[PDB]
Design an enzyme around this catalytic site. Structure first.
Site, PDB file in Angstrom:
ATOM      1  N   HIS A 251      34.473  48.692  36.391  1.00 35.02           N
ATOM      2  CA  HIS A 251      33.630  48.032  36.695  1.00 35.02           C
ATOM      3  C   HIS A 251      32.586  49.275  37.487  1.00 35.02           C
ATOM      4  O   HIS A 251      33.554  50.362  37.732  1.00 35.02           O
ATOM      5  CB  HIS A 251      33.872  46.773  37.912  1.00 35.02           C
ATOM      6  N   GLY A 252      31.363  49.003  37.857  1.00 32.76           N
ATOM      7  CA  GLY A 252      30.600  50.043  38.730  1.00 32.76           C
ATOM      8  C   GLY A 252      30.241  49.747  40.052  1.00 32.76           C
ATOM      9  O   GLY A 252      31.098  49.142  40.317  1.00 32.76           O
ATOM     10  N   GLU A 253      29.633  50.046  40.699  1.00 30.35           N
ATOM     11  CA  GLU A 253      28.844  49.798  42.232  1.00 30.35           C
ATOM     12  C   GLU A 253      29.900  47.979  42.973  1.00 30.35           C
ATOM     13  O   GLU A 253      29.439  48.446  42.394  1.00 30.35           O
ATOM     14  CB  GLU A 253      27.724  50.168  42.457  1.00 30.35           C
TER      15      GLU A 253
ATOM     16  N   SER B 265      38.213  50.450  48.486  1.00 30.06           N
ATOM     17  CA  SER B 265      38.261  48.829  48.247  1.00 30.06           C
ATOM     18  C   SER B 265      38.996  48.191  48.231  1.00 30.06           C
ATOM     19  O   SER B 265      39.318  47.419  48.823  1.00 30.06           O
ATOM     20  CB  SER B 265      36.815  48.814  47.886  1.00 30.06           C
ATOM     21  N   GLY B 266      40.117  49.019  47.446  1.00 31.78           N
ATOM     22  CA  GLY B 266      41.548  48.620  47.065  1.00 31.78           C
ATOM     23  C   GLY B 266      41.394  47.268  46.749  1.00 31.78           C
ATOM     24  O   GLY B 266      40.832  46.934  45.755  1.00 31.78           O
TER      25      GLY B 266
ATOM     26  N   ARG C 137      34.842  41.866  41.054  1.00 26.13           N
ATOM     27  CA  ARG C 137      33.998  43.589  40.359  1.00 26.13           C
ATOM     28  C   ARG C 137      34.076  43.450  39.208  1.00 26.13           C
ATOM     29  O   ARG C 137      33.557  43.742  38.861  1.00 26.13           O
ATOM     30  CB  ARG C 137      34.602  44.419  41.195  1.00 26.13           C
TER      31      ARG C 137
ATOM     32  N   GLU D 211      42.921  46.774  41.237  1.00 27.37           N
ATOM     33  CA  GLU D 211      42.465  48.703  41.940  1.00 27.37           C
ATOM     34  C   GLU D 211      43.589  48.750  42.754  1.00 27.37           C
ATOM     35  O   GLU D 211      44.902  48.181  43.428  1.00 27.37           O
ATOM     36  CB  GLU D 211      41.695  48.688  42.862  1.00 27.37           C
TER      37      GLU D 211
ATOM     38  N   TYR E  63      44.907  50.517  49.073  1.00 28.24           N
ATOM     39  CA  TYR E  63      44.687  51.965  49.945  1.00 28.24           C
ATOM     40  C   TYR E  63      45.176  51.287  51.098  1.00 28.24           C
ATOM     41  O   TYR E  63      45.368  51.661  52.140  1.00 28.24           O
ATOM     42  CB  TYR E  63      43.306  51.951  49.755  1.00 28.24           C
TER      43      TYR E  63
ATOM     44  N   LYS F 105      35.026  57.709  54.647  1.00 33.73           N
ATOM     45  CA  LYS F 105      35.728  59.255  54.649  1.00 33.73           C
ATOM     46  C   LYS F 105      36.046  60.103  56.020  1.00 33.73           C
ATOM     47  O   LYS F 105      36.694  60.726  55.952  1.00 33.73           O
ATOM     48  CB  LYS F 105      34.230  60.132  53.769  1.00 33.73           C
TER      49      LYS F 105
ATOM     50  N   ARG G 178      45.666  64.334  46.729  1.00 32.61           N
ATOM     51  CA  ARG G 178      46.066  65.963  46.024  1.00 32.61           C
ATOM     52  C   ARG G 178      47.977  64.520  45.590  1.00 32.61           C
ATOM     53  O   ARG G 178      48.500  65.584  44.296  1.00 32.61           O
ATOM     54  CB  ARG G 178      46.162  66.915  46.907  1.00 32.61           C
TER      55      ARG G 178
ATOM     56  N   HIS H 191      39.928  48.439  36.687  1.00 35.01           N
ATOM     57  CA  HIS H 191      39.825  49.435  37.601  1.00 35.01           C
ATOM     58  C   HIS H 191      40.312  50.683  37.803  1.00 35.01           C
ATOM     59  O   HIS H 191      40.742  51.453  36.887  1.00 35.01           O
ATOM     60  CB  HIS H 191      40.188  48.876  39.035  1.00 35.01           C
TER      61      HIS H 191
END
Ligand SMILES: CC(=O)Oc1ccccc1S(=O)(=O)Nc1cc2c(c(O)c1O)C(=O)c1ccccc1C2=O
Ligand SMILES: [Cl-]
Lengths: 233, 234
Positions: A9-11, A21-22, A60, A87, A90, A98, A115, A184
């Site tokens: 999916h996009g935005e 968003s998780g 979404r 998704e 998180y 950020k 990482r 996702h």
């Protein structure tokens, strides 16, 4: 050969894709909705037909699937939803941009999470604005206390996506069912990793484009016969 | 009551406007039709309705209605089951014709007979019918047996292929305690209402279900209504 299509999916609204968003059930932004329509047309123009569709329980991805199905006139197809294609969860970072993340946890720790393949973020605690909104959402009510994540590493996310791929998706492919998967970035990452036998480091480098049909041509062993291909221009 | 069941007939379609017989033709919602399904959804949402599973046909006017409803109530995550058995009545050779064309070719009398009859089918859709390929050769019906793919249906035929789905796939879910939403078509929902309330053939043919409005049933453990159906809205 078998043919498989993926779509990411996009935005989502309120810039939530840049805000971890998780598991928060953000809707598509109008732009994200337009990407899905563009991708739908790509598939229509290409004359693609499907027999079964898989998606997550997050709107979404579901609305992305709806938009594609609408565009290719196959709203009649069977659709299967599963949390397993959700998704990545998180944890405590969910909803933070950020700068808020760096400020709250420090650049050194954030770089390590970013990482690492096997290190989860911190769990979503009851003081988190999304804590009860997600953890008590009735769509997860049948999940055992261990299946319902408070947070996930990429490794965790892939581990719960693949059992679904193996038990539900694979059998369909092996019966010649043409499969569409609308999900996702991180759950798709898991499928792409298993398909191409990528390494942990390689999958963390892979950034699937959004709103664009991703085509796989698989042999009888479900091994890709060529690199992933994209539809559009 | 032990159980709660919600039905909704699809919103106005593009062919309802043109006043053409759709039947199995996969006509989409008109913009008003979409607004109807939306209001249905808002009604369900204001009343705090929750579901666990959704049934619908393979026709997009019903599907888009369900979609619009699931959107209004924020339950897009629910499992959805599609079946041809919940399809609109198959209007055979009448498919595609409007009011004038139907009366012109068959006469008002004949139209009266079909209208008031429970078990008399319209003429069959034959290979030279302009919608024959469109419906009879649509791959969504690829898995039907020769007997199942109809050339036409009386209301009786429609109900006869709809009830098997009700008894085998819907009933068990309800007795499993799942809250069911069924978004379908006038005549297919007629079969369900006829079975629930035990209505006579004449009683069911007199039953007009409104487009896009939620119909609520309060059922006992044997799926018998404790009270008359209720509409939802303002
Ligand atoms: C001559 C013709 O039928 O025109 C049309 C076309 C579309 C809708 C309504 C009409 S109508 O003015 O005649 N009224 C009208 C006509 C009909 C029906 C109905 O409920 C109705 O209200 C039926 O149920 C019906 C069922 C089975 C066969 C024919 C009819 C039918 O012909
Ligand atoms: Cl669906």
């Amino acid at each position: 050969a078998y043919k498989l299509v993926l779509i990411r999916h996009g935005e989502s609204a309120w810039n939530l894709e840049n805000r971890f968003s998780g598991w928060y059930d953000a809707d598509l932004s109008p732009a994200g909705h337009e990407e899905a329509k563009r991708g739908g047309q790509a598939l229509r123009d290409a004359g693609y037909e499907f027999d079964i569709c898989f998606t997550s329980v997050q709107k979404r991805a579901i609305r992305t699937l709806w938009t594609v199905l609408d565009a290719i006139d196959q709203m009649w197809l069977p659709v299967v939803r599963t949390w397993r294609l959700n998704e990545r969860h998180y944890g405590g970072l969910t909803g933070l941009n950020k700068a808020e993340t760096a400020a709250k946890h420090g650049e050194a720790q954030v770089k390590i999470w970013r990482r690492s393949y096997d290190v989860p973020p911190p769990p979503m605690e009851p003081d988190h604005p999304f804590y009860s909104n997600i953890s008590k959402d009735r769509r997860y009510a049948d999940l055992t206390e261990d299946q319902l994540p408070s947070c996930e590493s990429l490794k965790d996310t892939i581990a719960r996506a693949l059992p679904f791929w193996n038990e539900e998706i694979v059998p369909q492919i092996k019966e010649g069912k043409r499969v569409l998967i609308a999900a996702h970035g991180n759950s798709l990452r898991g499928i792409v990793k298993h398909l191409e036998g990528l390494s942990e480091e390689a999958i963390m480098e892979l950034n699937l484009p959004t709103g664009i049909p991703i085509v796989y041509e698989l042999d009888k062993n479900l091994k890709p016969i060529k690199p992933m291909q994209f539809l559009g221009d």
